[PDB]
C-alpha cells in the first residue's frame, strides 16, 4: 500500500544499520584479539583463512562436540534403521524405532541415562491413570524440580566421568518432561472410543524414546506422532533419498554461516567482558545486540533442522523452523513464530486449561502469566530468567491491550474517517519501534544476563537519552515497516 520508493528506502536503511554495525563489531574484535585470547581460549582452525573462532557460547560448542563424537553416527543410524523397517516390516516400525532409541540413549548416557528416563516416564504414566489435570501437572512439576536440587546433582555427577555427559543427561531429562506431560494430559482428556487404544504404555514409550528429538529436539505433538506411526503407507524411497540431499545442502549452509559469524565477531567473549562492554561505541553496542540474536536464530536453525530433516524422512510433519529474527517486530509475533513446537505445547497444555482469552482482561493476564512462569521455570529458574519472563509478559500484555483498544468500534471508526490508510500504517510502524526496542532488550537479558541488560539500559536510554535513543528508535522505525510489510504475506 505504501509507495514503492518509500518502502525501498526503508529496506535500504534497514540493511544499512545491520551491515555497518557488523563492521563495527568486527573491528572491535581484531583490536582486542590478544586481550581476549588470554581470558578466553580462541580456537584455531583452517576454516576461514587463519581467523580464530570464539567458542564461548557453550551451546554451539557443547552440541558440536557431541555431534562430532557420537550424535551424527547415531542419527545416521536412525535413518538407516528406519528405512529398513519400512521396506521390510512397516507394521512393527514404531517398536523398532523405540528399541533403537533405547539403545542409542544407552550408548551415550550409560545405564543411568536409560534408567532415569524410564523412571520419569513410569511415574508419570501411573499418576495419569487417575485422569486428573491437577495431579498430572503437579507430578510433572515435582519431577522437573528434582533435576535442579543440590543433593540430586551431586549423586548424578558421580555417575559420569567428564561432566560433559552429566550435562547431556540434564538436557535430555528436561526435554523428556514435556513429552510425558503431553501424553499424560491427553490421556486425562480422552473421551472418544476409537482413541482409547492410543494411550497404552507401549505407545508412551515409543513417543518418549523417539531418537531424533531425544536430547534437545523440539516438542512434537503426540497427535501427529500417533497418526503417522499407524499410516502403513510409505513414500517412495527414491523421493526420500531426494529430500535428504536437499536438506543436507541447506543444513551445511546454515552451519557455515554460524561458523563465519563466530570467526568474524567475538560477541560471546565480549558479553563476558563487562568492563569492555562499557567502553565500546554505541554502534558497537547495536551491532553486538544484532549479532547475538542472529547467531541464536542461526544456531537453532541448525539445532532444530537436523531433527526436522530426520522426521521428514520418517513421513512426519515437524513444527515449522523459526522465522528470521530480522523480520520480527512485536512480542506476540515473536513468540508465535520462533519456537513453534513449544508455542503449540504452551497453547494446548498451559494456556487454554487456565482459561485464556475467554474471561476477558483479568483472565488473559493470569493465563499469560502462568505460561511465562512455567517457561521460565522450565529453563532453569534463574534470576535473569525471571526478569526475562516478566519483561515478555508485560510486552505481550501491552500489545493485546492496545490492540483491543484500537479495535473498538468507536475508536476504529474515528481513526478510519480522519486518517488515511498510509498514515495508519506509519503510526503502526512507529509504535512497533518502541515495542521492538523493548523486545530486543528483554532477549538481551536472556542471552547475556542482568549485567548486560543494565549496561544496555544505561548506555542507550539514560546516558545517551536525547540523541542515541532517538537514532536507535529511528532505525527501528524503518526496520518495522519492512517487518509489517513482509508479515502481510503469512499472517
Amino acid at each position: 500500500m505504501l509507495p514503492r520508493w518509500e518502502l525501498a528506502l526503508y529496506l535500504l536503511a534497514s540493511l544499512g544499520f545491520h551491515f555497518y554495525s557488523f563492521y563495527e563489531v568486527y573491528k572491535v574484535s581484531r583490536e582486542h584479539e590478544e586481550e581476549l585470547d588470554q581470558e578466553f581460549e580462541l580456537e584455531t582452525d583452517t576454516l576461514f583463512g587463519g581467523l580464530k573462532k570464539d567458542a564461548t557460547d557453550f551451546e554451539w560448542s557443547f552440541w558440536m562436540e557431541w555431534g562430532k563424537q557420537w550424535l551424527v553416527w547415531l542419527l545416521l543410524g536412525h535413518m538407516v534403521v528406519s528405512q529398513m523397517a519400512t521396506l521390510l516390516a512397516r507394521k512393527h516400525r514404531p517398536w523398532i524405532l523405540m528399541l533403537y532409541g533405547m539403545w542409542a540413549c544407552w550408548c551415550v548416557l550409560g545405564t543411568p541415562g536409560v534408567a532415569m528416563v524410564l523412571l520419569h516416564t513410569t511415574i508419570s504414566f501411573c499418576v495419569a491413570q487417575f485422569r486428573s489435570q491437577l495431579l498430572t501437572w503437579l507430578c510433572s512439576l515435582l519431577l522437573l524440580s528434582t533435576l535442579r536440587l543440590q543433593g540430586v546433582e551431586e549423586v548424578k555427577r558421580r555417575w559420569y566421568k567428564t561432566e560433559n555427559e552429566y550435562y547431556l543427561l540434564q538436557f535430555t531429562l528436561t526435554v523428556r518432561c514435556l513429552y510425558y506431560t503431553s501424553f499424560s494430559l491427553e490421556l486425562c482428556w480422552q473421551q472418544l472410543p476409537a482413541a482409547s487404544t492410543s494411550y497404552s504404555f507401549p505407545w508412551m514409550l515409543a513417543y518418549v524414546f523417539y531418537y531424533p528429538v531425544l536430547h534437545n529436539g523440539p516438542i512434537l505433538s503426540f497427535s501427529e506422532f500417533i497418526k503417522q506411526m499407524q499410516q502403513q503407507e510409505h513414500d517412495s524411497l527414491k523421493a526420500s533419498l531426494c529430500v535428504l540431499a536437499l536438506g543436507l545442502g541447506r543444513l551445511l549452509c546454515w552451519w557455515w554461516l554460524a561458523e563465519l559469524m563466530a570467526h568474524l565477531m567475538y560477541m560471546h567473549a565480549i558479553y563476558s567482558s563487562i568492563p569492555l562492554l562499557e567502553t565500546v561505541s554505541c554502534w558497537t553496542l547495536g551491532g553486538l545486540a544484532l549479532a547475538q540474536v542472529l547467531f541464536f536464530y542461526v544456531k537453532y536453525l541448525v539445532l532444530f533442522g537436523v531433527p526436522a530433516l530426520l522426521m521428514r524422512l520418517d513421513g512426519l510433519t515437524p513444527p515449522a523452523l523459526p522465522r528470521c529474527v530480522s523480520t520480527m517486530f512485536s512480542f506476540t509475533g515473536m513468540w508465535r513464530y520462533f519456537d513453534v513446537g513449544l508455542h503449540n505445547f504452551l497453547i494446548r497444555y498451559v494456556y487454554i486449561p487456565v482459561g485464556g482469552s475467554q474471561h476477558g482482561l483479568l483472565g488473559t493476564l493470569f493465563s499469560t502469566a502462568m505460561t511465562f512462569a512455567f517457561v521460565s521455570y522450565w529453563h532453569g529458574g534463574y534470576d535473569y530468567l525471571w526478569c526475562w519472563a516478566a519483561l515478555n509478559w508485560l510486552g505481550v500484555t501491552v500489545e493485546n491491550g492496545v490492540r483491543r483498544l484500537v479495535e473498538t468500534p468507536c475508536i476504529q471508526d474515528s481513526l478510519a474517517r480522519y486518517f488515511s490508510p498510509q498514515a495508519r500504517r506509519r503510526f503502526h510502524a512507529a509504535l512497533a519501534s518502541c515495542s521492538t526496542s523493548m523486545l530486543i532488550l528483554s532477549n538481551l537479558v536472556f542471552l547475556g544476563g542482568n549485567e548486560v541488560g543494565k549496561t544496555y539500559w544505561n548506555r542507550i536510554f539514560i546516558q545517551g537519552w536525547p540523541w542515541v535513543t532517538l537514532s536507535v528508535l529511528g532505525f527501528l522505525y524503518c526496520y518495522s515497516h519492512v517487518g509489517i510489510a513482509w508479515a502481510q504475506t503469512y499472517a
Epitope: 582486542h32 586481550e35 588470554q38 581470558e39 567482558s273 563487562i274 568492563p275 569492555l276 562499557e278
Partner: antibody, heavy 118, light 109 residues
C-alpha cells in the same frame, strides 16, 4: 607487558591518615581496574576495593567502606588509596593488583607497601 | 558475602610426592566457574596460577591441576619440586566482589 610500581613504606601515627599510590604501565585496553589488597603479617589476603583510573568507577568491600577512599589520575594513570582513623590493626602490607580485560583475575601485582601504625 | 574455606591450613610433604589442597564455598560460583588459585612465596608477592577453576596460566608448570564442580574445588600438585614451598589461596571471582580463602601453607621441612 603491564608493570605496576607502588610508593614507599609509611610510618603513620594512631588516629592519622596515609595516602599511598600505584602507577600502572603498559596497558593496551581502556577500562582496566586497579585493586587494593591488604595482608596482615602472618595472615591471608583481603580485597579492599577497585578504582578505574580512566573511567572513575569504584567498588568497595563492606568491611572497608567508610574508612577507605580510592582516587585516580587519568593523565598519570595512577591510583590512590587513603585510610583514615588508623589504628594498630591497620599495620599491614597493602598490594596494588591489576586485572585484565574481564576484570576478574589479578594478573599483575606491585611490590606492596609496608604501613606501620605507631 | 560468599565465605571461602580452605583445607588444610598447613601441609607437610616430602620432595617429589603429590599434594592436594581443597577449597569450599558457601554459595555455588558456576555461571564457566569463577574461581582462581594464587601462589605466594615467603619473600614475594602473590602470583596468579589458575583461572576459570581448571585453566592453567602462561608459564606455570604442568604439575599444577585445578578441578571442582559446584561448591567444592581442589588444586593438585603431581610432584613437588621443592620450589613449590609457598602459600596457596583460592579466590572466588566476579560472581561477587572478590573474597579470598584462608590459605594453605606447604612446608617441605
Amino acid at each position: 607487558q603491564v608493570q605496576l610500581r607502588q610508593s614507599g613504606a609509611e610510618l603513620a601515627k594512631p588516629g592519622a591518615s596515609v595516602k599511598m599510590s600505584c602507577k600502572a604501565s603498559g596497558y593496551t585496553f581502556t577500562n582496566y581496574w586497579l585493586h587494593w589488597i591488604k595482608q596482615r603479617p602472618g595472615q591471608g589476603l583481603e580485597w579492599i576495593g577497585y578504582i578505574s583510573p580512566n573511567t572513575g568507577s569504584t567498588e568497595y568491600s563492606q568491611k572497608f567502606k567508610d574508612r577507605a577512599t580510592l582516587t585516580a589520575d587519568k593523565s598519570s594513570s595512577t591510583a590512590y588509596m587513603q585510610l583514615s582513623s588508623l589504628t594498630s590493626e591497620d599495620s599491614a602490607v597493602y598490594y596494588c593488583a591489576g586485572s585484565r580485560i574481564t576484570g576478574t583475575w589479578f594478573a599483575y601485582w606491585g611490590q606492596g607497601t609496608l604501613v606501620t601504625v605507631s | 558475602d560468599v565465605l571461602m574455606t580452605q583445607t588444610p591450613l598447613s601441609l607437610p610433604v616430602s620432595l617429589g610426592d603429590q599434594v592436594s589442597i581443597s577449597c569450599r564455598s558457601s554459595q555455588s560460583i558456576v555461571h564457566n566457574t569463577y574461581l582462581e588459585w594464587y601462589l605466594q612465596k615467603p619473600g614475594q608477592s602473590p602470583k596468579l596460577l589458575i583461572y576459570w577453576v581448571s585453566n592453567r596460566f602462561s608459564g606455570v608448570p604442568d604439575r599444577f591441576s585445578g578441578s571442582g564442580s559446584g561448591t567444592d574445588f581442589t588444586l593438585k600438585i603431581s610432584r613437588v619440586e621443592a620450589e613449590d614451598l609457598g602459600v596457596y589461596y583460592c579466590f572466588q571471582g566476579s560472581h561477587v566482589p572478590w573474597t579470598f580463602g584462608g590459605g594453605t601453607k606447604l612446608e617441605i621441612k
